[PDB]
Amino acid sequence: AISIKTPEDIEKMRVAGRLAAEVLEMIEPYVKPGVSTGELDRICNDYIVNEQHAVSACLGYHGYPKSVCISINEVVCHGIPDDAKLLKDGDIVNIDVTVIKDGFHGDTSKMFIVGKPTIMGERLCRITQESLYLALRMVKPGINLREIGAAIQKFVEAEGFSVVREYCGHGIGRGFHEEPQVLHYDSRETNVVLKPGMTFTIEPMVNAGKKEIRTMKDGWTVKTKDRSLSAQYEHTIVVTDNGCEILTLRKDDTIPAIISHD
Numbered sequence: 074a075i076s077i078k079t080p081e082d083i084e085k086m087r088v089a090g091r092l093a094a095e096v097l098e099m100i101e102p103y104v105k106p107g108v109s110t111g112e113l114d115r116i117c118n119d120y121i122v123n124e125q126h127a128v129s130a131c132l133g134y135h136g137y138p139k140s141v142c143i144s145i146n147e148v149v150c151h152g153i154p155d156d157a158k159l160l161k162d163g164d165i166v167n168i169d170v171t172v173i174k175d176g177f178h179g180d181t182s183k184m185f186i187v188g189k190p191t192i193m194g195e196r197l198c199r200i201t202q203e204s205l206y207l208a209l210r211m212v213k214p215g216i217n218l219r220e221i222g223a224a225i226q227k228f229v230e231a232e233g234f235s236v237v238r239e240y241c242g243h244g245i246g247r248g249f250h251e252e253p254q255v256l257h258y259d260s261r262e263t264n265v266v267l268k269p270g271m272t273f274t275i276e277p278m279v280n281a282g283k284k285e286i287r288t289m290k291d292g293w294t295v296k297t298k299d300r301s302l303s304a305q306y307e308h309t310i311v312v313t314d315n316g317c318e319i320l321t322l323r324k325d326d327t328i329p330a331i332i333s334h335d
């Protein structure tokens with residue numbers, strides 16, 4: 074079933090969420106033309122282990138080789154940090170962080186634009202974050218996840234973009250991926266009414282082109298089939314009595330931590 078976190082458990086999620094968010098705030102200065110995704114991964118890992126005294130939940134997850142996922146341009150998700158892959162002017166890059174602290178998970182990601190941003194790259198990233206924000210503004214007890222997924226899809230497609238179907242948001246806590254599944258599109262299978270205490274992620278993956286994806290032969294990297302740009306933003310939240318609280322909020326987020334509907 075779906076778990077309703079306790080006040081104590083929620084406090085632990087606040088800590089884990091903050092740490093995840095701070096990894097993203099910490100790495101920002103290093104995301105510039107010339108750096109390798111491999112070094113970026115090392116930097117994130119050292120920070121998590123030595124400074125936050127936490128652990129990367131991704132490192133080794135189902136056999137994943139690195140501490141964070143770094144996806145560039147047409148890569149949709151799970152990009153594998155590589156010492157030989159260098160960021161270049163105009164790139165859009167997602168760094169997906171997941172930390173475990175005191176038994177609980179904090180899951181978040183954001184887009185970074187490298188060097189001189191291209192108008193389109195800036196547009197895809199802006200719209201993708203807006204779709205996440207729009208969804209977060211809908212979160213409150215009584216609402217069905219199907220509604221939220223439908224709203225994200227409607228917004229995204231109105232921009233000429235598409236929503237990746239193979240990946241979704243998810244419940245989160247002592248487990249990395251717990252129930253429920255949080256689709257970012259309208260599905261006839263989705264029927265989940267939100268309840269206070271539920272903790273999950275919303276992490277829409279949006280393609281500039283078609284929704285179809287392709288997995289590489291390294292068993293992890295995923296790209297858009299048509300090789301169009303893809304962007305993603307993610308936040309871990311807890312449903313409150315009449316809204317929600319974003320546990321992974323950053324200084325650059327342009328949305329409040331507490332979203333009440335009173």
Ligand SMILES: NNC(=O)c1cn2ccc3ccccc3c2n1
Nearest residue numbers: 131134135137142169170180181
């Ligand atoms: N924040 N993004 C995520 O939810 C995420 C991030 N990751 C990273 C690796 C991975 C490996 C196997 C299954 C899922 C994952 C995964 N999910």
Ligand SMILES: [Mn+2]
Nearest residue numbers: 180274276307
């Ligand atoms: Mn996630």
Ligand code: NA
Nearest residue numbers: 145146148303
């Ligand atoms: Na991408």
